[PDB]
Protein backbone atom coordinates (compact mmCIF):
# COMPACT_ATOMS: atom_id res chain seq x y z
CA UNK A 1 0.00 0.00 0.00
CA UNK A 2 3.01 2.29 0.36
CA UNK A 3 4.10 1.27 -3.14
CA UNK A 4 0.62 1.93 -4.53
CA UNK A 5 0.08 5.36 -2.93
CA UNK A 6 3.48 6.57 -4.10
CA UNK A 7 2.73 5.38 -7.64
CA UNK A 8 -0.61 7.23 -7.84
CA UNK A 9 1.13 10.44 -6.76
CA UNK A 10 3.76 9.96 -9.47
CA UNK A 11 0.95 10.28 -12.03
CA UNK A 12 0.00 13.61 -10.42
CA UNK A 13 3.41 15.26 -10.89
CA UNK A 14 4.07 13.84 -14.37
CA UNK A 15 0.73 14.89 -15.86
CA UNK A 16 0.87 18.38 -14.32
CA UNK A 17 4.38 19.03 -15.71
CA UNK A 18 4.50 17.25 -19.09
CA UNK A 19 1.83 18.65 -21.40
CA UNK A 20 2.72 16.15 -24.15
CA UNK A 21 1.70 13.13 -22.05
CA UNK A 22 -1.94 13.71 -23.08
CA UNK A 23 -1.06 14.08 -26.76
CA UNK A 24 -3.41 11.29 -27.87
CA UNK A 25 -6.37 13.47 -26.90
CA UNK A 26 -4.58 16.47 -28.40
CA UNK A 27 -4.64 15.14 -31.97
CA UNK A 28 -8.42 14.66 -31.79
CA UNK A 29 -9.23 18.27 -30.89
CA UNK A 30 -6.61 19.78 -33.22
CA UNK A 31 -7.35 17.82 -36.41
CA UNK A 32 -11.07 18.49 -35.97
CA UNK A 33 -10.30 22.19 -35.50
CA UNK A 34 -8.06 22.09 -38.58
CA UNK A 35 -10.85 20.41 -40.56
CA UNK A 36 -13.24 23.23 -39.65
CA UNK A 37 -10.57 25.85 -40.41
CA UNK A 38 -9.85 24.60 -43.95
CA UNK A 39 -13.56 24.93 -44.75
CA UNK A 40 -13.22 28.63 -43.86
CA UNK A 41 -10.20 29.50 -46.04
CA UNK A 42 -11.59 27.53 -49.01
CA UNK A 43 -14.43 30.08 -49.18
CA UNK A 44 -11.89 32.78 -50.08
CA UNK A 45 -10.62 30.86 -53.11
CA UNK A 46 -12.07 31.47 -56.57
CA UNK A 47 -11.95 27.84 -57.93
CA UNK A 48 -10.79 29.22 -61.28
CA UNK B 1 -31.59 45.42 -37.02
CA UNK B 2 -31.46 42.73 -39.71
CA UNK B 3 -31.57 44.85 -42.89
CA UNK B 4 -30.11 44.75 -46.38
CA UNK B 5 -26.83 46.47 -47.20
CA UNK B 6 -25.77 48.52 -50.22
CA UNK B 7 -22.45 50.33 -49.68
CA UNK B 8 -21.06 51.20 -53.18
CA UNK B 9 -21.67 47.63 -54.36
CA UNK B 10 -20.71 45.88 -51.09
CA UNK B 11 -23.93 44.03 -50.35
CA UNK B 12 -24.70 42.02 -47.25
CA UNK B 13 -27.22 41.09 -44.59
CA UNK B 14 -26.81 41.64 -40.86
CA UNK B 15 -26.88 44.21 -38.08
CA UNK B 16 -24.71 47.27 -37.45
CA UNK B 17 -22.95 47.88 -34.13
CA UNK B 18 -20.35 50.42 -33.04
CA UNK B 19 -16.78 49.35 -33.77
CA UNK B 20 -14.11 49.68 -31.08
CA UNK B 21 -11.00 49.07 -33.21
CA UNK B 22 -8.62 51.52 -34.86
CA UNK B 23 -9.11 52.13 -38.57
CA UNK B 24 -7.41 53.83 -41.52
CA UNK B 25 -8.61 57.11 -43.13
CA UNK B 26 -8.28 55.68 -46.66
CA UNK B 27 -10.03 52.41 -45.73
CA UNK B 28 -13.19 51.43 -47.60
CA UNK B 29 -13.84 48.09 -45.86
CA UNK B 30 -12.15 45.43 -43.76
CA UNK B 31 -11.98 41.65 -43.93
CA UNK B 32 -12.14 38.86 -41.36
CA UNK B 33 -10.40 35.46 -41.28
CA UNK B 34 -12.82 34.20 -43.97
CA UNK B 35 -11.82 37.19 -46.22
CA UNK B 36 -15.34 38.61 -46.57
CA UNK B 37 -17.17 41.81 -45.66
CA UNK B 38 -17.46 42.44 -41.91
CA UNK B 39 -16.77 46.15 -41.29
CA UNK B 40 -17.91 49.02 -43.53
CA UNK B 41 -17.22 52.74 -43.13
CA UNK B 42 -20.00 55.05 -44.30
CA UNK B 43 -19.12 57.07 -47.45
CA UNK B 44 -20.90 60.19 -46.12
CA UNK B 45 -20.78 59.93 -42.31
CA UNK B 46 -17.63 58.06 -41.14
CA UNK B 47 -18.71 55.34 -38.81
CA UNK B 48 -16.85 52.17 -39.09
From Swiss-Prot, chain B:
Name of this protein: Spike protein S1
Outcome (variant: residue 34 to D): In strain: Alpha/B.1.1.7
SUBUNIT field: Binds to host ACE2. RBD also interacts with the N-linked glycan on 'Asn-90' of ACE2. Cleavage of S generates a polybasic C-terminal sequence on S1 that binds to host Neuropilin-1 (NRP1) and Neuropilin-2 (NRP2) receptors. Interacts with host integrin alpha-5/beta-1 (ITGA5:ITGB1) and with ACE2 in complex with integrin alpha-5/beta-1 (ITGA5:ITGB1). May interact via cytoplasmic c-terminus with M protein. May interact (via N-terminus) with host bilirubin and biliverdin, thereby preventing antibody binding to the SARS-CoV-2 spike NTD via an allosteric mechanism.
Described function: Attaches the virion to the cell membrane by interacting with host receptor, initiating the infection. The major receptor is host ACE2. When S2/S2' has been cleaved, binding to the receptor triggers direct fusion at the cell membrane. When S2/S2' has not been cleaved, binding to the receptor results in internalization of the virus by endocytosis using host TFRC and GRM2 and leading to fusion of the virion membrane with the host endosomal membrane. Alternatively, may use NRP1/NRP2 and integrin as entry receptors.
Amino acid sequence: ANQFNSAIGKIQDSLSSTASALGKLQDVVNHNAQALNTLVKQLSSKFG
Amino acid sequence: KCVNFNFNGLKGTGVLTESNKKFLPFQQFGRDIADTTDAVRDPQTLEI
